[PDB]
Amino acid sequence: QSALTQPASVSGSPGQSITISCTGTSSDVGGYNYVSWYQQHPGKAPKLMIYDVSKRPSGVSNRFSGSKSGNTASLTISGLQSEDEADYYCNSLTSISTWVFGGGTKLTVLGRTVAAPSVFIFPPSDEQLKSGTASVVCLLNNFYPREAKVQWKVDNALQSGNSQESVTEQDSKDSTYSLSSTLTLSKADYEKHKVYACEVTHQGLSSPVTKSFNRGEC
Amino acid sequence: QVQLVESGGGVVQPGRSLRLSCAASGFTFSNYAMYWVRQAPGKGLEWVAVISYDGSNKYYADSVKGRFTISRDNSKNTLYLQMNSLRTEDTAVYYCASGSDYGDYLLVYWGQGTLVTVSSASTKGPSVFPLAPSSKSTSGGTAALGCLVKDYFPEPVTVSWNSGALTSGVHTFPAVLQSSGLYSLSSVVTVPSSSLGTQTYICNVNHKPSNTKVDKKVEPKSC
Amino acid sequence: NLCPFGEVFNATRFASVYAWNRKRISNCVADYSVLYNSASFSTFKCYGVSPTKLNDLCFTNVYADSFVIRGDEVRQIAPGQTGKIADYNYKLPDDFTGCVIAWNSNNLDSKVGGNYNYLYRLFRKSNLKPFERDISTEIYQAGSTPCNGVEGFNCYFPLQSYGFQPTYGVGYQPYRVVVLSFELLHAPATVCGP
Ligand SMILES: *[C@@H]1O[C@H](CO)[C@@H](O[C@@H]2O[C@H](CO)[C@@H](O)[C@H](O)[C@H]2NC(C)=O)[C@H](O)[C@H]1NC(C)=O
């Protein structure tokens, strides 16, 4: 499927103007003008915002406008109110009677001052290793920007794919965010390794923060 | 007003067939069109199928073309989707949507999609393990403590804590699936070092497919 | 009294081309200037009359015909034109015929898989007389040696459906047309402008 290309994320300060772009084939967005834009807050059904020739449905604020230029189309939002952070998807009709959706753009509004993450690391070693499997866990608490990058280090060697991370939703009391990080290993490999560490680089921090421990200390 | 409701979506094993229904009220369902759209959790939207006002014409995405079938009963304001040979890539959320006066080609109205996942794994219950409080955690007189769950398949879970009466500083992160195909989750609470030596923290996990709970206590390891 | 042009233009569903509905307008005050200057009308051609003058005019009674037709065919709906729709479906007179109004209602009239609710006369024995209307839908076989005996389906069928699809594009889009006729001298005036 000729899924339309979109920027992974865009951000703007409240009250600013921001524009999201959508791009496709000369027969997927070129020619026809049926390009439409959808909005989906988390946990609920998508809404639509724009359709053919940038028209707007009744009951939607006039803050949203759309534009087309051949192979590309764009959605511009103004007066950011922090409620527009919902991801936006573009949609268009194509020859051979087929619909295509864009990869979706996530909008982040800088609705508050930057807040730094608190970081913790824990071995689930005793019960998990007795069960017969090994994992290492790293915790990032109440940060704001949520653009944080996380890296796992073993013997100062970098690991990827062997870990899974989960980020909780925006805490409405302070708009902060938190991330959970965990790398998984087999008992033999877990015993082979000597040092375990997690590293994070994020706008919420002035410089990267790394936490580490050696399995042999205890 | 206009409203749509989807029903029948749920857990199934791979390779089986399943049927979904969508019901609409408040508009001339026979006049416009009905569409199906799915969203794999953590990914964008993609189009699955469409049917015409009369039901005489149907179209499908290449991923589902020929596999799935779409049908409607304009005498009941009811829509149906038939799924066959379900695969691990079909584990998405499916929404029904219809055209409107704004344009038959536009997904004007949307329901609230059902969740469908194919898995050969049984309804394995979770197991709870504790996090080790230590110097690499407890710092500045403040510390985090946590419990960890070992992978389990069923979707419903709930974590309980002594702090459940006042969940200040408590988090229950969204569960994630291991390559095993079973879900797992972590939960943590932030507490003061004075509490580590004076208050017991124990976590208990609720799992609807197995009313027998699991619980584990966290205590400050010397590590 | 206000005039039902609102319901005339926004009737939600116009009659097919072959069976074009009519409605008599009487005792109205016709605010033609506010209608004409609207941006939605893609064309507002008028014959024997000019659109800005319309408020300075005052006819006895006026009729409005309505049908949905394709963009290329809208050109045929003009006095003195010829073609499949002008000849068979709706013969506009070779004389004055008032304003012809059309707008591109592709959003409402077109549908996925093609709208079959709108039909046109593929052929007829002879072209229609001005403002002639017929509903006679009988297969044109004529029996005889040339074609299958009467009642048979060998010689096609008189009507066909447009099947308006979004894919049809700007050329084949379905337009909604309304046309008004003005007559004079045969009676005293009953409707005038504001
Ligand atoms: C058909 O409906 C449209 C939409 O309601 C009418 O246009 C509106 O007319 C009112 C009164 O003049 C204006 O205040 C609105 O701004 C118009 N809306 C739009 C979107 O243009 C239209 O007048 C109706 N048809 C006729 C013949 O009047």
mmCIF file with all atom_site columns, all heavy atoms in Angstrom, chain C residues 31-32 57 60 69 78 82 84 86 101 105 118-119 122 147 154 156-157 159 173 177-178 183 189:
data_model
loop_
_atom_site.group_PDB
_atom_site.id
_atom_site.type_symbol
_atom_site.label_atom_id
_atom_site.label_alt_id
_atom_site.label_comp_id
_atom_site.label_asym_id
_atom_site.label_entity_id
_atom_site.label_seq_id
_atom_site.pdbx_PDB_ins_code
_atom_site.Cartn_x
_atom_site.Cartn_y
_atom_site.Cartn_z
_atom_site.occupancy
_atom_site.B_iso_or_equiv
_atom_site.pdbx_formal_charge
_atom_site.auth_seq_id
_atom_site.auth_comp_id
_atom_site.auth_asym_id
_atom_site.auth_atom_id
_atom_site.pdbx_PDB_model_num
ATOM 1   N N   . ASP C 1 31  ? -36.093 37.224 -4.423  1.00 0.00 ? 31  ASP C N   1
ATOM 2   C CA  . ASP C 1 31  ? -34.838 37.906 -4.111  1.00 0.00 ? 31  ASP C CA  1
ATOM 3   C C   . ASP C 1 31  ? -33.716 37.379 -5.013  1.00 0.00 ? 31  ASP C C   1
ATOM 4   O O   . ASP C 1 31  ? -32.690 36.877 -4.557  1.00 0.00 ? 31  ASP C O   1
ATOM 5   C CB  . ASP C 1 31  ? -34.510 37.734 -2.635  1.00 0.00 ? 31  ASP C CB  1
ATOM 6   C CG  . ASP C 1 31  ? -35.631 38.211 -1.734  1.00 0.00 ? 31  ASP C CG  1
ATOM 7   O OD1 . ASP C 1 31  ? -36.739 37.639 -1.811  1.00 0.00 ? 31  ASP C OD1 1
ATOM 8   O OD2 . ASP C 1 31  ? -35.409 39.159 -0.952  1.00 0.00 ? 31  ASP C OD2 1
ATOM 9   N N   . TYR C 1 32  ? -33.933 37.478 -6.324  1.00 0.00 ? 32  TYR C N   1
ATOM 10  C CA  . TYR C 1 32  ? -32.958 36.939 -7.269  1.00 0.00 ? 32  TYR C CA  1
ATOM 11  C C   . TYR C 1 32  ? -31.540 37.448 -7.035  1.00 0.00 ? 32  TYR C C   1
ATOM 12  O O   . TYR C 1 32  ? -30.587 36.679 -7.164  1.00 0.00 ? 32  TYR C O   1
ATOM 13  C CB  . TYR C 1 32  ? -33.360 37.229 -8.717  1.00 0.00 ? 32  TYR C CB  1
ATOM 14  C CG  . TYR C 1 32  ? -34.566 36.471 -9.216  1.00 0.00 ? 32  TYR C CG  1
ATOM 15  C CD1 . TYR C 1 32  ? -35.828 37.042 -9.229  1.00 0.00 ? 32  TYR C CD1 1
ATOM 16  C CD2 . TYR C 1 32  ? -34.419 35.197 -9.747  1.00 0.00 ? 32  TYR C CD2 1
ATOM 17  C CE1 . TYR C 1 32  ? -36.915 36.347 -9.722  1.00 0.00 ? 32  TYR C CE1 1
ATOM 18  C CE2 . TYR C 1 32  ? -35.497 34.497 -10.233 1.00 0.00 ? 32  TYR C CE2 1
ATOM 19  C CZ  . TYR C 1 32  ? -36.742 35.077 -10.223 1.00 0.00 ? 32  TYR C CZ  1
ATOM 20  O OH  . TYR C 1 32  ? -37.817 34.380 -10.717 1.00 0.00 ? 32  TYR C OH  1
ATOM 21  N N   . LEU C 1 57  ? -37.507 43.107 -12.454 1.00 0.00 ? 57  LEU C N   1
ATOM 22  C CA  . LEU C 1 57  ? -38.514 42.481 -13.294 1.00 0.00 ? 57  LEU C CA  1
ATOM 23  C C   . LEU C 1 57  ? -39.665 41.969 -12.432 1.00 0.00 ? 57  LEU C C   1
ATOM 24  O O   . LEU C 1 57  ? -39.603 41.983 -11.200 1.00 0.00 ? 57  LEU C O   1
ATOM 25  C CB  . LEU C 1 57  ? -37.895 41.332 -14.095 1.00 0.00 ? 57  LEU C CB  1
ATOM 26  C CG  . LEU C 1 57  ? -36.748 41.701 -15.038 1.00 0.00 ? 57  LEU C CG  1
ATOM 27  C CD1 . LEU C 1 57  ? -36.224 40.460 -15.742 1.00 0.00 ? 57  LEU C CD1 1
ATOM 28  C CD2 . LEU C 1 57  ? -37.176 42.747 -16.057 1.00 0.00 ? 57  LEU C CD2 1
ATOM 29  N N   . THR C 1 60  ? -45.655 37.052 -14.247 1.00 0.00 ? 60  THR C N   1
ATOM 30  C CA  . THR C 1 60  ? -46.901 36.513 -13.717 1.00 0.00 ? 60  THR C CA  1
ATOM 31  C C   . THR C 1 60  ? -46.637 35.338 -12.785 1.00 0.00 ? 60  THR C C   1
ATOM 32  O O   . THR C 1 60  ? -46.743 35.468 -11.562 1.00 0.00 ? 60  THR C O   1
ATOM 33  C CB  . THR C 1 60  ? -47.812 36.050 -14.855 1.00 0.00 ? 60  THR C CB  1
ATOM 34  O OG1 . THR C 1 60  ? -47.074 35.193 -15.733 1.00 0.00 ? 60  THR C OG1 1
ATOM 35  C CG2 . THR C 1 60  ? -48.321 37.233 -15.651 1.00 0.00 ? 60  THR C CG2 1
ATOM 36  N N   . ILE C 1 69  ? -27.492 16.050 -13.706 1.00 0.00 ? 69  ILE C N   1
ATOM 37  C CA  . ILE C 1 69  ? -26.893 15.723 -14.995 1.00 0.00 ? 69  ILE C CA  1
ATOM 38  C C   . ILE C 1 69  ? -25.392 15.932 -14.902 1.00 0.00 ? 69  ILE C C   1
ATOM 39  O O   . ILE C 1 69  ? -24.887 16.602 -14.000 1.00 0.00 ? 69  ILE C O   1
ATOM 40  C CB  . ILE C 1 69  ? -27.455 16.577 -16.158 1.00 0.00 ? 69  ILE C CB  1
ATOM 41  C CG1 . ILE C 1 69  ? -27.290 18.069 -15.872 1.00 0.00 ? 69  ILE C CG1 1
ATOM 42  C CG2 . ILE C 1 69  ? -28.895 16.250 -16.427 1.00 0.00 ? 69  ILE C CG2 1
ATOM 43  C CD1 . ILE C 1 69  ? -27.408 18.921 -17.105 1.00 0.00 ? 69  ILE C CD1 1
ATOM 44  N N   . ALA C 1 78  ? -29.286 24.229 -22.942 1.00 0.00 ? 78  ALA C N   1
ATOM 45  C CA  . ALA C 1 78  ? -29.299 25.619 -23.366 1.00 0.00 ? 78  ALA C CA  1
ATOM 46  C C   . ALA C 1 78  ? -30.191 25.717 -24.593 1.00 0.00 ? 78  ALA C C   1
ATOM 47  O O   . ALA C 1 78  ? -30.308 24.744 -25.345 1.00 0.00 ? 78  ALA C O   1
ATOM 48  C CB  . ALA C 1 78  ? -27.890 26.137 -23.681 1.00 0.00 ? 78  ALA C CB  1
ATOM 49  N N   . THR C 1 82  ? -28.369 20.650 -29.016 1.00 0.00 ? 82  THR C N   1
ATOM 50  C CA  . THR C 1 82  ? -28.797 19.325 -29.427 1.00 0.00 ? 82  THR C CA  1
ATOM 51  C C   . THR C 1 82  ? -27.863 18.308 -28.791 1.00 0.00 ? 82  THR C C   1
ATOM 52  O O   . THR C 1 82  ? -26.725 18.616 -28.430 1.00 0.00 ? 82  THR C O   1
ATOM 53  C CB  . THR C 1 82  ? -28.801 19.173 -30.954 1.00 0.00 ? 82  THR C CB  1
ATOM 54  O OG1 . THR C 1 82  ? -29.439 17.942 -31.318 1.00 0.00 ? 82  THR C OG1 1
ATOM 55  C CG2 . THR C 1 82  ? -27.380 19.200 -31.513 1.00 0.00 ? 82  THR C CG2 1
ATOM 56  N N   . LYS C 1 84  ? -27.973 13.982 -26.829 1.00 0.00 ? 84  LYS C N   1
ATOM 57  C CA  . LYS C 1 84  ? -28.761 12.890 -26.273 1.00 0.00 ? 84  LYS C CA  1
ATOM 58  C C   . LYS C 1 84  ? -29.732 13.349 -25.188 1.00 0.00 ? 84  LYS C C   1
ATOM 59  O O   . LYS C 1 84  ? -30.922 13.011 -25.228 1.00 0.00 ? 84  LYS C O   1
ATOM 60  C CB  . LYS C 1 84  ? -27.805 11.838 -25.709 1.00 0.00 ? 84  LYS C CB  1
ATOM 61  C CG  . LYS C 1 84  ? -28.393 10.446 -25.591 1.00 0.00 ? 84  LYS C CG  1
ATOM 62  C CD  . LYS C 1 84  ? -28.373 9.688  -26.923 1.00 0.00 ? 84  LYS C CD  1
ATOM 63  C CE  . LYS C 1 84  ? -26.999 9.626  -27.579 1.00 0.00 ? 84  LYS C CE  1
ATOM 64  N NZ  . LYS C 1 84  ? -26.987 8.699  -28.745 1.00 0.00 ? 84  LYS C NZ  1
ATOM 65  N N   . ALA C 1 86  ? -30.601 16.672 -24.490 1.00 0.00 ? 86  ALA C N   1
ATOM 66  C CA  . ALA C 1 86  ? -31.464 17.737 -24.978 1.00 0.00 ? 86  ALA C CA  1
ATOM 67  C C   . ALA C 1 86  ? -32.525 17.180 -25.907 1.00 0.00 ? 86  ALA C C   1
ATOM 68  O O   . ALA C 1 86  ? -33.678 17.629 -25.890 1.00 0.00 ? 86  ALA C O   1
ATOM 69  C CB  . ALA C 1 86  ? -30.634 18.802 -25.689 1.00 0.00 ? 86  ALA C CB  1
ATOM 70  N N   . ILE C 1 101 ? -29.457 27.267 -13.937 1.00 0.00 ? 101 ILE C N   1
ATOM 71  C CA  . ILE C 1 101 ? -28.551 27.294 -12.794 1.00 0.00 ? 101 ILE C CA  1
ATOM 72  C C   . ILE C 1 101 ? -28.024 25.889 -12.562 1.00 0.00 ? 101 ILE C C   1
ATOM 73  O O   . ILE C 1 101 ? -28.800 24.928 -12.540 1.00 0.00 ? 101 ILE C O   1
ATOM 74  C CB  . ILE C 1 101 ? -29.261 27.809 -11.532 1.00 0.00 ? 101 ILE C CB  1
ATOM 75  C CG1 . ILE C 1 101 ? -30.045 29.084 -11.837 1.00 0.00 ? 101 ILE C CG1 1
ATOM 76  C CG2 . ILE C 1 101 ? -28.256 28.051 -10.423 1.00 0.00 ? 101 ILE C CG2 1
ATOM 77  C CD1 . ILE C 1 101 ? -29.245 30.126 -12.546 1.00 0.00 ? 101 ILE C CD1 1
ATOM 78  N N   . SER C 1 105 ? -22.747 19.071 -7.359  1.00 0.00 ? 105 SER C N   1
ATOM 79  C CA  . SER C 1 105 ? -23.157 18.372 -6.146  1.00 0.00 ? 105 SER C CA  1
ATOM 80  C C   . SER C 1 105 ? -22.526 16.991 -6.024  1.00 0.00 ? 105 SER C C   1
ATOM 81  O O   . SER C 1 105 ? -23.152 16.078 -5.470  1.00 0.00 ? 105 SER C O   1
ATOM 82  C CB  . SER C 1 105 ? -24.677 18.258 -6.101  1.00 0.00 ? 105 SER C CB  1
ATOM 83  O OG  . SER C 1 105 ? -25.139 17.455 -7.165  1.00 0.00 ? 105 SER C OG  1
ATOM 84  N N   . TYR C 1 118 ? -30.094 7.676  -10.675 1.00 0.00 ? 118 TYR C N   1
ATOM 85  C CA  . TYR C 1 118 ? -30.252 8.659  -11.741 1.00 0.00 ? 118 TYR C CA  1
ATOM 86  C C   . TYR C 1 118 ? -30.083 7.992  -13.099 1.00 0.00 ? 118 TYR C C   1
ATOM 87  O O   . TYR C 1 118 ? -29.084 7.308  -13.341 1.00 0.00 ? 118 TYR C O   1
ATOM 88  C CB  . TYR C 1 118 ? -29.251 9.802  -11.573 1.00 0.00 ? 118 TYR C CB  1
ATOM 89  C CG  . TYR C 1 118 ? -29.331 10.463 -10.217 1.00 0.00 ? 118 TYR C CG  1
ATOM 90  C CD1 . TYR C 1 118 ? -28.187 10.737 -9.483  1.00 0.00 ? 118 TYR C CD1 1
ATOM 91  C CD2 . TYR C 1 118 ? -30.557 10.810 -9.669  1.00 0.00 ? 118 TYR C CD2 1
ATOM 92  C CE1 . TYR C 1 118 ? -28.265 11.330 -8.235  1.00 0.00 ? 118 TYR C CE1 1
ATOM 93  C CE2 . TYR C 1 118 ? -30.646 11.391 -8.421  1.00 0.00 ? 118 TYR C CE2 1
ATOM 94  C CZ  . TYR C 1 118 ? -29.497 11.656 -7.711  1.00 0.00 ? 118 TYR C CZ  1
ATOM 95  O OH  . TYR C 1 118 ? -29.580 12.280 -6.487  1.00 0.00 ? 118 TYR C OH  1
ATOM 96  N N   . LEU C 1 119 ? -31.062 8.200  -13.983 1.00 0.00 ? 119 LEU C N   1
ATOM 97  C CA  . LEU C 1 119 ? -31.127 7.532  -15.274 1.00 0.00 ? 119 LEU C CA  1
ATOM 98  C C   . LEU C 1 119 ? -31.395 8.547  -16.381 1.00 0.00 ? 119 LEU C C   1
ATOM 99  O O   . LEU C 1 119 ? -31.956 9.618  -16.148 1.00 0.00 ? 119 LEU C O   1
ATOM 100 C CB  . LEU C 1 119 ? -32.215 6.452  -15.282 1.00 0.00 ? 119 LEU C CB  1
ATOM 101 C CG  . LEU C 1 119 ? -32.088 5.400  -14.178 1.00 0.00 ? 119 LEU C CG  1
ATOM 102 C CD1 . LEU C 1 119 ? -33.001 5.737  -13.014 1.00 0.00 ? 119 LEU C CD1 1
ATOM 103 C CD2 . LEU C 1 119 ? -32.397 4.012  -14.714 1.00 0.00 ? 119 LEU C CD2 1
ATOM 104 N N   . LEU C 1 122 ? -31.581 6.615  -23.301 1.00 0.00 ? 122 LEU C N   1
ATOM 105 C CA  . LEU C 1 122 ? -30.538 6.299  -24.264 1.00 0.00 ? 122 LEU C CA  1
ATOM 106 C C   . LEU C 1 122 ? -30.968 6.646  -25.687 1.00 0.00 ? 122 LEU C C   1
ATOM 107 O O   . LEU C 1 122 ? -30.165 7.161  -26.471 1.00 0.00 ? 122 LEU C O   1
ATOM 108 C CB  . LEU C 1 122 ? -30.184 4.817  -24.168 1.00 0.00 ? 122 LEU C CB  1
ATOM 109 C CG  . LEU C 1 122 ? -28.994 4.334  -24.995 1.00 0.00 ? 122 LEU C CG  1
ATOM 110 C CD1 . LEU C 1 122 ? -27.718 4.985  -24.470 1.00 0.00 ? 122 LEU C CD1 1
ATOM 111 C CD2 . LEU C 1 122 ? -28.888 2.817  -24.990 1.00 0.00 ? 122 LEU C CD2 1
ATOM 112 N N   . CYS C 1 147 ? -35.814 -6.969 -35.406 1.00 0.00 ? 147 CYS C N   1
ATOM 113 C CA  . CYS C 1 147 ? -35.472 -7.287 -34.025 1.00 0.00 ? 147 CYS C CA  1
ATOM 114 C C   . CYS C 1 147 ? -36.461 -8.287 -33.439 1.00 0.00 ? 147 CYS C C   1
ATOM 115 O O   . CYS C 1 147 ? -37.500 -8.603 -34.027 1.00 0.00 ? 147 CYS C O   1
ATOM 116 C CB  . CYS C 1 147 ? -35.426 -6.014 -33.161 1.00 0.00 ? 147 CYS C CB  1
ATOM 117 S SG  . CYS C 1 147 ? -34.713 -6.226 -31.496 1.00 0.00 ? 147 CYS C SG  1
ATOM 118 N N   . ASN C 1 154 ? -33.937 -8.325 -26.548 1.00 0.00 ? 154 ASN C N   1
ATOM 119 C CA  . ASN C 1 154 ? -32.817 -8.337 -27.485 1.00 0.00 ? 154 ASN C CA  1
ATOM 120 C C   . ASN C 1 154 ? -32.317 -6.933 -27.815 1.00 0.00 ? 154 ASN C C   1
ATOM 121 O O   . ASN C 1 154 ? -31.107 -6.685 -27.830 1.00 0.00 ? 154 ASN C O   1
ATOM 122 C CB  . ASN C 1 154 ? -33.216 -9.059 -28.771 1.00 0.00 ? 154 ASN C CB  1
ATOM 123 C CG  . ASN C 1 154 ? -32.118 -9.028 -29.814 1.00 0.00 ? 154 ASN C CG  1
ATOM 124 O OD1 . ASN C 1 154 ? -30.935 -8.965 -29.480 1.00 0.00 ? 154 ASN C OD1 1
ATOM 125 N ND2 . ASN C 1 154 ? -32.502 -9.072 -31.084 1.00 0.00 ? 154 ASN C ND2 1
ATOM 126 N N   . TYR C 1 156 ? -31.722 -4.125 -26.418 1.00 0.00 ? 156 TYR C N   1
ATOM 127 C CA  . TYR C 1 156 ? -31.292 -3.373 -25.240 1.00 0.00 ? 156 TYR C CA  1
ATOM 128 C C   . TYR C 1 156 ? -32.418 -2.971 -24.289 1.00 0.00 ? 156 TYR C C   1
ATOM 129 O O   . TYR C 1 156 ? -33.363 -3.736 -24.078 1.00 0.00 ? 156 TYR C O   1
ATOM 130 C CB  . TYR C 1 156 ? -30.563 -2.102 -25.689 1.00 0.00 ? 156 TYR C CB  1
ATOM 131 C CG  . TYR C 1 156 ? -29.678 -2.259 -26.902 1.00 0.00 ? 156 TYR C CG  1
ATOM 132 C CD1 . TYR C 1 156 ? -30.110 -1.840 -28.152 1.00 0.00 ? 156 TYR C CD1 1
ATOM 133 C CD2 . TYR C 1 156 ? -28.400 -2.788 -26.793 1.00 0.00 ? 156 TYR C CD2 1
ATOM 134 C CE1 . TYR C 1 156 ? -29.306 -1.968 -29.264 1.00 0.00 ? 156 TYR C CE1 1
ATOM 135 C CE2 . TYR C 1 156 ? -27.588 -2.924 -27.902 1.00 0.00 ? 156 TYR C CE2 1
ATOM 136 C CZ  . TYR C 1 156 ? -28.046 -2.509 -29.135 1.00 0.00 ? 156 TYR C CZ  1
ATOM 137 O OH  . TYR C 1 156 ? -27.235 -2.622 -30.241 1.00 0.00 ? 156 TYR C OH  1
ATOM 138 N N   . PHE C 1 157 ? -32.331 -1.765 -23.724 1.00 0.00 ? 157 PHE C N   1
ATOM 139 C CA  . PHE C 1 157 ? -33.342 -1.216 -22.832 1.00 0.00 ? 157 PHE C CA  1
ATOM 140 C C   . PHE C 1 157 ? -33.323 0.301  -22.963 1.00 0.00 ? 157 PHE C C   1
ATOM 141 O O   . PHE C 1 157 ? -32.255 0.885  -23.177 1.00 0.00 ? 157 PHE C O   1
ATOM 142 C CB  . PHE C 1 157 ? -33.069 -1.646 -21.381 1.00 0.00 ? 157 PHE C CB  1
ATOM 143 C CG  . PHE C 1 157 ? -34.171 -1.306 -20.423 1.00 0.00 ? 157 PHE C CG  1
ATOM 144 C CD1 . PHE C 1 157 ? -35.192 -2.205 -20.181 1.00 0.00 ? 157 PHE C CD1 1
ATOM 145 C CD2 . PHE C 1 157 ? -34.158 -0.115 -19.728 1.00 0.00 ? 157 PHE C CD2 1
ATOM 146 C CE1 . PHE C 1 157 ? -36.195 -1.909 -19.278 1.00 0.00 ? 157 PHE C CE1 1
ATOM 147 C CE2 . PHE C 1 157 ? -35.162 0.191  -18.829 1.00 0.00 ? 157 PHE C CE2 1
ATOM 148 C CZ  . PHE C 1 157 ? -36.177 -0.710 -18.600 1.00 0.00 ? 157 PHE C CZ  1
ATOM 149 N N   . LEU C 1 159 ? -33.631 2.894  -20.802 1.00 0.00 ? 159 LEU C N   1
ATOM 150 C CA  . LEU C 1 159 ? -32.925 3.682  -19.801 1.00 0.00 ? 159 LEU C CA  1
ATOM 151 C C   . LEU C 1 159 ? -31.584 3.080  -19.391 1.00 0.00 ? 159 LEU C C   1
ATOM 152 O O   . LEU C 1 159 ? -31.359 1.872  -19.494 1.00 0.00 ? 159 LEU C O   1
ATOM 153 C CB  . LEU C 1 159 ? -33.803 3.810  -18.552 1.00 0.00 ? 159 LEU C CB  1
ATOM 154 C CG  . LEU C 1 159 ? -35.135 4.528  -18.732 1.00 0.00 ? 159 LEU C CG  1
ATOM 155 C CD1 . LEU C 1 159 ? -35.993 4.398  -17.497 1.00 0.00 ? 159 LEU C CD1 1
ATOM 156 C CD2 . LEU C 1 159 ? -34.843 5.982  -18.987 1.00 0.00 ? 159 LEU C CD2 1
ATOM 157 N N   . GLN C 1 173 ? -18.422 14.529 -13.260 1.00 0.00 ? 173 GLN C N   1
ATOM 158 C CA  . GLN C 1 173 ? -19.125 14.784 -12.013 1.00 0.00 ? 173 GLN C CA  1
ATOM 159 C C   . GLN C 1 173 ? -20.608 15.019 -12.274 1.00 0.00 ? 173 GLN C C   1
ATOM 160 O O   . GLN C 1 173 ? -21.002 15.417 -13.372 1.00 0.00 ? 173 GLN C O   1
ATOM 161 C CB  . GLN C 1 173 ? -18.568 16.013 -11.297 1.00 0.00 ? 173 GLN C CB  1
ATOM 162 C CG  . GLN C 1 173 ? -17.099 15.972 -11.002 1.00 0.00 ? 173 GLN C CG  1
ATOM 163 C CD  . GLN C 1 173 ? -16.747 14.994 -9.905  1.00 0.00 ? 173 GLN C CD  1
ATOM 164 O OE1 . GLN C 1 173 ? -16.606 15.370 -8.743  1.00 0.00 ? 173 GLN C OE1 1
ATOM 165 N NE2 . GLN C 1 173 ? -16.618 13.723 -10.266 1.00 0.00 ? 173 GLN C NE2 1
ATOM 166 N N   . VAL C 1 177 ? -29.125 20.695 -11.642 1.00 0.00 ? 177 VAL C N   1
ATOM 167 C CA  . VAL C 1 177 ? -29.600 21.803 -12.456 1.00 0.00 ? 177 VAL C CA  1
ATOM 168 C C   . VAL C 1 177 ? -31.011 22.187 -12.056 1.00 0.00 ? 177 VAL C C   1
ATOM 169 O O   . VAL C 1 177 ? -31.835 21.326 -11.732 1.00 0.00 ? 177 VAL C O   1
ATOM 170 C CB  . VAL C 1 177 ? -29.548 21.441 -13.952 1.00 0.00 ? 177 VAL C CB  1
ATOM 171 C CG1 . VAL C 1 177 ? -30.204 22.525 -14.783 1.00 0.00 ? 177 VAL C CG1 1
ATOM 172 C CG2 . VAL C 1 177 ? -28.118 21.231 -14.382 1.00 0.00 ? 177 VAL C CG2 1
ATOM 173 N N   . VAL C 1 178 ? -31.278 23.487 -12.063 1.00 0.00 ? 178 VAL C N   1
ATOM 174 C CA  . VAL C 1 178 ? -32.632 24.007 -11.993 1.00 0.00 ? 178 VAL C CA  1
ATOM 175 C C   . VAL C 1 178 ? -32.752 25.055 -13.087 1.00 0.00 ? 178 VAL C C   1
ATOM 176 O O   . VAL C 1 178 ? -31.789 25.765 -13.390 1.00 0.00 ? 178 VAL C O   1
ATOM 177 C CB  . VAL C 1 178 ? -32.964 24.583 -10.601 1.00 0.00 ? 178 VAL C CB  1
ATOM 178 C CG1 . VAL C 1 178 ? -32.719 23.521 -9.537  1.00 0.00 ? 178 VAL C CG1 1
ATOM 179 C CG2 . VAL C 1 178 ? -32.170 25.847 -10.325 1.00 0.00 ? 178 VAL C CG2 1
ATOM 180 N N   . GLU C 1 183 ? -43.011 33.902 -18.375 1.00 0.00 ? 183 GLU C N   1
ATOM 181 C CA  . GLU C 1 183 ? -43.977 34.235 -19.418 1.00 0.00 ? 183 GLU C CA  1
ATOM 182 C C   . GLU C 1 183 ? -44.704 35.531 -19.070 1.00 0.00 ? 183 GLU C C   1
ATOM 183 O O   . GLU C 1 183 ? -44.907 35.849 -17.895 1.00 0.00 ? 183 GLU C O   1
ATOM 184 C CB  . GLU C 1 183 ? -44.978 33.096 -19.641 1.00 0.00 ? 183 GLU C CB  1
ATOM 185 C CG  . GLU C 1 183 ? -45.776 32.696 -18.423 1.00 0.00 ? 183 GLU C CG  1
ATOM 186 C CD  . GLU C 1 183 ? -45.020 31.711 -17.563 1.00 0.00 ? 183 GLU C CD  1
ATOM 187 O OE1 . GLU C 1 183 ? -43.772 31.749 -17.580 1.00 0.00 ? 183 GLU C OE1 1
ATOM 188 O OE2 . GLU C 1 183 ? -45.665 30.876 -16.901 1.00 0.00 ? 183 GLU C OE2 1
ATOM 189 N N   . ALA C 1 189 ? -49.420 40.495 -13.489 1.00 0.00 ? 189 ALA C N   1
ATOM 190 C CA  . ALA C 1 189 ? -48.315 40.019 -12.669 1.00 0.00 ? 189 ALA C CA  1
ATOM 191 C C   . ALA C 1 189 ? -48.801 39.597 -11.288 1.00 0.00 ? 189 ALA C C   1
ATOM 192 O O   . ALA C 1 189 ? -49.759 40.151 -10.742 1.00 0.00 ? 189 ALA C O   1
ATOM 193 C CB  . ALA C 1 189 ? -47.247 41.102 -12.534 1.00 0.00 ? 189 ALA C CB  1
#
